[PDB]
Amino acid sequence: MSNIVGIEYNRVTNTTSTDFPGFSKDAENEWNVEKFKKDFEVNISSLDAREANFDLINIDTSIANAFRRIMISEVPSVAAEYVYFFNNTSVIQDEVLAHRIGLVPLKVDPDMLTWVDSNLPDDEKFTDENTIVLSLNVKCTRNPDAPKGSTDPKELYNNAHVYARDLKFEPQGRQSTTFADCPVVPADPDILLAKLRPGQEISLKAHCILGIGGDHAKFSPVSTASYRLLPQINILQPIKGESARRFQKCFPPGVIGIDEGSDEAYVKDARKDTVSREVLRYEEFADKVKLGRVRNHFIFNVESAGAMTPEEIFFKSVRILKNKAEYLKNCPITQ
């Protein structure tokens, strides 16, 4: 019990739940919403765009994994799905160049589109409100200036490097007034996409649609989304004198610092100790330190690919876990 995962030099201990009635005779911690609503707290650390950092307290490690798997898979987004080629005489072959276009992020958010229905025949499948079309036409020619030889092939040739910003959004009908205030752009518009030499052109258009992340990893909105737990170091005997500086170079440089008054070690700013278990090797700190990791303090860290704010997907992950367990509260059980 006491919800502390026990780090030692070859194992970890009691990693499982033990939070259920029928574990001891005094069958406590039954389910109760008001007994849950008091202890659950959230502490938001440094928050900006394209990164979030926030804590979730006193939830069991079963449901903290449920929010990780939904941000990667279930929360939908947009990316390319069909690439139509005009004349391409570049050295990069077609369905490689059509594959690097699919993974490019887009700054348009979902909820602007509907789910495509592929049951229909393939000419009204792409309607006017579930698909935006974007294209590019670019040709490399010779630049007529006078440098000398062997210089940068950014001025011997004009536009000999194509970038992600070359995807000119080509708005179809019925949406020239809807996407007017916020046009779509690649979320990182400096991505190198191909290379050209004079006489070689690239001309295509793509039909980017609404897709689910767990189908293909074009569609995933996060860069990556995982979590940690809070580390915890206990000091049994006072380390004093010469040893406490030897005790200090076996850690990341922030986590423990010397008391400047009396030469004794204590814990500085925590949450920075990655578990290098370096104090286990030295057989003089075999009794002075009993370090661990608490089992109800999840250090989340989500990131975005550029489509939307990082505090939006974590709102949208918990919103669709409820609907995932609401859709089968309301359907009959067939025998």
Partner 1 sequence: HYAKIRPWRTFRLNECVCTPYNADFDGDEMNLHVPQTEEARAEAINLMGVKNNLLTPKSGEPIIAATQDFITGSYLISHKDSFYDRATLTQLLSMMSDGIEHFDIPPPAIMKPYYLWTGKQVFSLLIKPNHNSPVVINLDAKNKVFVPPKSKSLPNEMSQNDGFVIIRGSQILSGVMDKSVLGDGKKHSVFYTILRDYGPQEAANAMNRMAKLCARFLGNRGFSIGINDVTPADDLKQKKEEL
Partner 2 sequence: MIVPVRCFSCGKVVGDKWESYLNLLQEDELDEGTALSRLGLKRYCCRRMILTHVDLIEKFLRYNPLE
Partner 3 sequence: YQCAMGKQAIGAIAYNQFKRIDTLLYLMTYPQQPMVKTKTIELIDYDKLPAGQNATVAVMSYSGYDIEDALVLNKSSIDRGFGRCETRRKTTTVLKRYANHTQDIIGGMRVDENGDPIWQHQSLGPDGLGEVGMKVQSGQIYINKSVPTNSADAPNPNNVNVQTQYREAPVIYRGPEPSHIDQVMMSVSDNDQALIKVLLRQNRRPELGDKFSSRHGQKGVCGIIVKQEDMPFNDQGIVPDIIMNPHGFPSRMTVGKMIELISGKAGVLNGTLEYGTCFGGSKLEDMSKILVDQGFNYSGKDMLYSGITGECLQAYIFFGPIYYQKLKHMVLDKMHARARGPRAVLTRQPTEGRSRDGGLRLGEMERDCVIAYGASQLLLERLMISSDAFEVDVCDKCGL
Using CB under 8 A as the binding rule, whether residue 193 contacts partner 2 is answered as yes
Using CB under 8 A as the binding rule, whether residue 77 contacts partner 2 is answered as no
Distance in Å, CB of 303 to partner 2, minimum: 7
Using CB under 8 A as the binding rule, whether residue 195 contacts partner 2 is answered as yes
Q: How far is CA 170 from CA 74, 159, 211, 306, in A?
A: 29, 21, 20, 21
Local structure of 70: helix, strand or coil: helix
- The terminus-to-terminus CA distance of the chain in angstroms comes to 41
Residue among 110, 189, 198, 214 that touches partner 3 (CB under 8 A): 214
Distance in Å, CB of 82 to partner 3, minimum: 14
With contacts defined by CB under 8 A, how many residues of the chain interact with partner 2?
27
What would the two tokens of residue 281 be? 């090797």
Say which residue the tokens 């200090």 belong to: 248
Which of partner 2, partner 3, partner 1, none does residue 20 bind to, with CB < 5 to 8 Å depending on kind? partner 1
Using CB under 8 A as the binding rule, whether residue 91 contacts partner 3 is answered as yes
Residues ≥6 apart with Cβ < 8 Å to 70: 317, 320, 321
Residue among 106, 132, 162, 225 that touches partner 3 (CB under 8 A): 225
Residues ≥6 apart with Cβ < 8 Å to 200: 89, 90, 91, 139, 140
Instruction: Identify which range of 23-31, 109-117, 191-199, 315-323 contacts partner 2 by CB under 8 A.
Output: 191-199
Interface characters, 110-139, with partner 3 (x: CB under 8 A): ------------------------------
Rounded Cα gap, residues 293 and 6, in angstroms: 6
Residue among 35, 69, 197, 216 that touches partner 2 (CB under 8 A): 197
Rounded Cα gap, residues 113 and 78, in angstroms: 9
Interface characters, 9-48, with partner 1 (x: CB under 8 A): -------xxx-x-xxxx-----------------------
Using CB under 8 A as the binding rule, whether residue 49 contacts partner 2 is answered as no
Rounded Cα gap, residues 103 and 223, in angstroms: 12
Contact 53, 192 (CB under 8 A): no
Using CB under 8 A as the binding rule, whether residue 51 contacts partner 2 is answered as no
- Of 176, 298, 288, give the one whose Cα is nearest residue 228: 298
What is the DSSP-derived secondary structure letter of residue 109? P
What would the two tokens of residue 215 be? 């189908």
Residues that bind partner 3 (CB under 8 A): 5, 10-13, 15-17, 61-62, 64-66, 68-69, 72-73, 85, 88, 91, 93-96, 99, 103, 214, 216-218, 220, 224-226, 228, 252, 274-278, 281, 293, 295, 301
Residues that bind partner 1 (CB under 8 A): 1, 16-18, 20, 22-25
